[PDB]
């Protein structure tokens, strides 16, 4: 027996599968169980032998993909591709909710850097979604004392106390009095999607000289970051400005369209990293093209 567990951001599904079972068969069963149709955004995340977080290929069997061995196999049904604008592209409520929960968790886990002012505004939309309108009676002082509202990095510059924070969030909850639940989630996603680290797939790489760098893959192309600045790219490669991309084993090369510009060469720890980089490039480029036809 092959026990597998797939979690969405708010559901947990446990399946028994077979050695012949494909990721697509698992993917489609999760998808119709929760009733989602905007499937192009999503995938089945897992951790592999080496402790890398990657995505299941749906065309290959679940067993042939080096998934970490644990009695319940662990898959996270998650957004794998991110729209250029959530307002135009996330239609179903199930899609919007799953994006909202996933993005909020990443922000709360300090995986996406977020200024404190934006963080409190984000927290206010989250409480308007969960609690509905602030009501003077049923929401007496201290009603968010047990809610996880802000990322810890924001707390570490602790000019405010744990109670001063909640009072300022409370203030902004009041300003959202008319807002319905789904629109509250969408306003959260509208703000969150403009953070610089939002929707970026980060890969640890090195240049030819051995200097460590980051490689970002997002909806608009490729970015090179210095190892100690993951916010602002030092080189940017939008799709329209790339002549070709390539890899051979560990060596990866980006050639810009300029023609006088030199290629950018970087090196991955192993071939599977470069394969995963390219797969995300192909997925993001295709959605990019499909948005413009």
């Amino acid at each position: 027996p092959i026990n597998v567990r797939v979690t969405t951001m708010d559901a947990e599904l446990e399946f028994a599968i077979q050695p012949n079972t494909t990721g697509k068969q698992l993917f489609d069963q999760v998808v119709k169980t929760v009733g989602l149709r905007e499937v192009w955004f999503f995938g089945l995340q897992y951790v592999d032998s080496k402790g890398y977080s990657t995505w299941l290929k749906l065309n290959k069997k679940v067993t042939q993909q080096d998934v970490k061995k644990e009695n319940p196999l662990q898959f996270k049904f998650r957004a794998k591709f991110f729209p250029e604008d959530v307002s135009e592209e996330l239609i179903q409520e199930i899609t919007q909710r799953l994006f909202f929960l996933q993005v909020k968790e990443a922000i709360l886990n300090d995986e996406i850097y977020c200024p404190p002012e934006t963080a409190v505004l984000l927290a206010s939309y989250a409480v308007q979604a969960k609690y509905g309108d602030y009501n003077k009676e049923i929401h007496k002082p201290g009603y968010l004392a047990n809610d996880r509202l802000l990322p810890q990095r924001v707390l570490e510059q602790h000019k405010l106390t744990k109670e001063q924070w909640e009072e300022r969030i409370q203030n902004w909850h009041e300003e959202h009095r008319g807002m319905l639940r789904e629109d509250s989630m969408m306003e959260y996603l509208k703000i969150a999607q403009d953070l610089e680290m939002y929707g970026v797939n980060y890969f640890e790489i090195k240049n030819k000289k051995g200097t460590e760098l980051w490689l970002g893959v997002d909806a608009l192309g490729l970015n090179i970051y210095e190892h100690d600045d993951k916010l602002t790219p030092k080189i940017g490669f939008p799709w329209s400005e790339i002549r070709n991309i390539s890899f051979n084993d560990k060596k990866f090369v980006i050639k810009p369209i300029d023609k006088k510009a030199p290629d950018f060469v970087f090196y991955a720890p192993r071939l599977r990293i470069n394969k995963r980089i390219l797969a995300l490039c192909m997925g993001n480029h295709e959605l990019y093209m499909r948005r413009r036809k």
Binding site: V4, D10, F15, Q25
Partner: peptide, 13 residues
């Protein structure tokens, strides 16, 4: 055909 069989669900609301 090797379809997965659901043996458990938890819904978190």
């Amino acid at each position: 055909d090797s379809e997965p069989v659901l043996k458990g669900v938890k819904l978190h609301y």
